[PDB]
Amino acid sequence: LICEVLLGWLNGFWIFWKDGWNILNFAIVFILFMGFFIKQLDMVAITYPLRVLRLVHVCMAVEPLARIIKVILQSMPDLANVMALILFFMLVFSVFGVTLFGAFVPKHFQ
Amino acid sequence: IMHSEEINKHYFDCVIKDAEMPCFLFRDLFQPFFLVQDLVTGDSGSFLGSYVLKVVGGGRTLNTIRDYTEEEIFRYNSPLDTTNSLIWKTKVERTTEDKKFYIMSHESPGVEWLCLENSPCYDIIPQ
Amino acid sequence: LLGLQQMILSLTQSLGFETFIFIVVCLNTVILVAQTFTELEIRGEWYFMVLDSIFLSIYVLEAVLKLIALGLEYFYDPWNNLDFFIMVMAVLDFVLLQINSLSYSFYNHSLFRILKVFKSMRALRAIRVLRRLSILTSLHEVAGTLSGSLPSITAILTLMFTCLFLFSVVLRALFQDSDPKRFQNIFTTLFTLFTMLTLDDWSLIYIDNRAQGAWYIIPILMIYIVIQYFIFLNLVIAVLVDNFQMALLKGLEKVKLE
Numbered sequence A: 001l002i003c004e005v006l007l008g009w010l011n012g013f014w015i016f017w018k019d020g021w022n023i024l025n026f027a028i029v030f031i032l033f034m035g036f037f038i039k040q041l042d043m044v045a046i047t048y049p050l051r052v053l054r055l056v057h058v059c060m061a062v063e064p065l066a067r068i069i070k071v072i073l074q075s076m077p078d079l080a081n082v083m084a085l086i087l088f089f090m091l092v093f094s095v096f097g098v099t100l101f102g103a104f105v106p107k108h109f110q
Numbered sequence B: 001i002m003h004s005e006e007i008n009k010h011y012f013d014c015v016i017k018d019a020e021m022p023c024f025l026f027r028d029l030f031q032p033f034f035l036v037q038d039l040v041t042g043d044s045g046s047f048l049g050s051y052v053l054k055v056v057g058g059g060r061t062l063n064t065i066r067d068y069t070e071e072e073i074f075r076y077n078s079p080l081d082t083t084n085s086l087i088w089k090t091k092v093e094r095t096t097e098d099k100k101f102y103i104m105s106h107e108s109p110g111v112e113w114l115c116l117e118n119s120p121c122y123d124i125i126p127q
Numbered sequence C: 001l002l003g004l005q006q007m008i009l010s011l012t013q014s015l016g017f018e019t020f021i022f023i024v025v026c027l028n029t030v031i032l033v034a035q036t037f038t039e040l041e042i043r044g045e046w047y048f049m050v051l052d053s054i055f056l057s058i059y060v061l062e063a064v065l066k067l068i069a070l071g072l073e074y075f076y077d078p079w080n081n082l083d084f085f086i087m088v089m090a091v092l093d094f095v096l097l098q099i100n101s102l103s104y105s106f107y108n109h110s111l112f113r114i115l116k117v118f119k120s121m122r123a124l125r126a127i128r129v130l131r132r133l134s135i136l137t138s139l140h141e142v143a144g145t146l147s148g149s150l151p152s153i154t155a156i157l158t159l160m161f162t163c164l165f166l167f168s169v170v171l172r173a174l175f176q177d178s179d180p181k182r183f184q185n186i187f188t189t190l191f192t193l194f195t196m197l198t199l200d201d202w203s204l205i206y207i208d209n210r211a212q213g214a215w216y217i218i219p220i221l222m223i224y225i226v227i228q229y230f231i232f233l234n235l236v237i238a239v240l241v242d243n244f245q246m247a248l249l250k251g252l253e254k255v256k257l258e
């Protein structure tokens, strides 16, 4: 993985960084790399699943798959707007529910 | 404090808490628990018996408490007084002779602080 | 009636009257979101009642002045109509408080709290503030398409409620004293059917009935689930997808217009 990041950088620092998949792979390999030096990161809860998040850019080459990921990524901002709607709706009802069922059923409404 | 915490699902102590005395919220119904202690022998147990509880003095601050007179104690602690002077009220059927004061017990609901307008606890604004 | 009302107007729609009121409403909502911790509401109870009487007086000011200014045109707009209803609740709980003894038995009275939540409704005015500052209209499009979808949403929603209501009536008629804990009352029949419509523990009521009563409830419940979850909610999904498809075609033709 480090060799591959080196090859990418060998083509020009900026174009390697003019992407998103490259910065993702770089972040993964860098977090993996600092485990050799630092001690509180070289633990399994931080090193194992990153080697599986490394696999998605591999799966991208399987374009019957890649179109699903591209759809998800493209639709993400609209989902952000819908998420904002739902949260902004939930906060108001949370206020009303607390100020009703406070001091009564405080297991759920304090 | 353990029982008030359980019934009233919340306990807040005085902002300037004192280790000697815990403080009780005027919103929560105050149900006190007493225990009888033998000093000769180690045996100490809860007081499973009836009693008459009365408020006989009050102070805006500590070191300002003043015993009230008998008429004042009557007007404050007894439901028979017409003047809006009651300091507390409890929902217990037992009562003393002449119905003057309630007869409480460990199984009673508790003491509900209400502070009618004539009562000394009324018209109190944080200093 | 022409000069007095008119100056009341030109002071009412003034670009400072609105900012003053929005400052009031944002302060009231920051208090109202302060009051939902129990570590601050219990401490600062004595200042909150003072502040809320202050806000009641301010709302008297605004509501009376707006009514005198704009006649029944004030009653015409629904944004204000919300404010008027909130006002009515505020004044009613004020007078009820004064006509009772503010003690523990009234703190734990349900009607006191019920009148208190409608005070929470004041926070709705805050959206008006958020509108002028801007919400960024990031959800202007989703809201617009939901706005387009609602006319049929209401219709299918009331149709499925009607199905709920008929099944609830018949289930009350039939399955009394076969688990009365669930639907011994018509209202709890109706709630049991409504909570079945979300499919949470719906097998539990079948098993519970089969234990002591009898199992005839299984064809009724299967047909119920078929109709409601399988053919009605999917209608809501379908109509929403079609509405957003129309929105998309409108956007495509509009962007090609330029």
Ligand SMILES: COCC(CCO[C@H]1CC[C@@]2(C)C(=CC[C@H]3[C@@H]4C[C@@H]5O[C@]6(CC[C@@H](C)CO6)[C@@H](C)[C@@H]5[C@@]4(C)CC[C@@H]32)C1)COC
Residues within 6 Å of the ligand: A085, A088, A089, A092, C124, C127, C131, C139, C140, C143, C144
């Ligand atoms: C007449 O024409 C008007 C048009 C401009 C229309 O702007 C709209 C923008 C979306 C917006 C702000 C509008 C109305 C309902 C608003 C929704 C009501 C719900 O309320 C909330 C908040 C309060 C909660 C109690 C309930 O949920 C939000 C989640 C929901 C809401 C605030 C999302 C945003 C919506 C106005 C211009 O025409 C020229």
Ligand SMILES: COCC(CCO[C@H]1CC[C@@]2(C)C(=CC[C@H]3[C@@H]4C[C@@H]5O[C@]6(CC[C@@H](C)CO6)[C@@H](C)[C@@H]5[C@@]4(C)CC[C@@H]32)C1)COC
Residues within 6 Å of the ligand: C077, C078, C079, C082, C124
């Ligand atoms: C951008 O400009 C828009 C303007 C037209 C504005 O019309 C408004 C009419 C009042 C109306 C319908 C509007 C927004 C919030 C609506 C309130 C949100 C609350 O939601 C409810 C129902 C849902 C509950 C969950 C919460 O409470 C109602 C009690 C409350 C409500 C539905 C009362 C009616 C309000 C839109 C035209 O401008 C040119």
Ligand SMILES: COCC(CCO[C@H]1CC[C@@]2(C)C(=CC[C@H]3[C@@H]4C[C@@H]5O[C@]6(CC[C@@H](C)CO6)[C@@H](C)[C@@H]5[C@@]4(C)CC[C@@H]32)C1)COC
Residues within 6 Å of the ligand: A085, A086, A089, C143, C144, C146, C147, C148, C150
């Ligand atoms: C720009 O001018 C537009 C104007 C026409 C405006 O029509 C409005 C009709 C009310 C309507 C449909 C609109 C926007 C917000 C909509 C609200 C957002 C909330 O969303 C919901 C449903 C989704 C939940 C997540 C949150 O709550 C509803 C309860 C609430 C809502 C759907 C009630 C209905 C509101 C559009 C014409 O002008 C010429």
Ligand code: NA
Residues within 6 Å of the ligand: C198, C199, C200, C201
């Ligand atoms: Na489920």
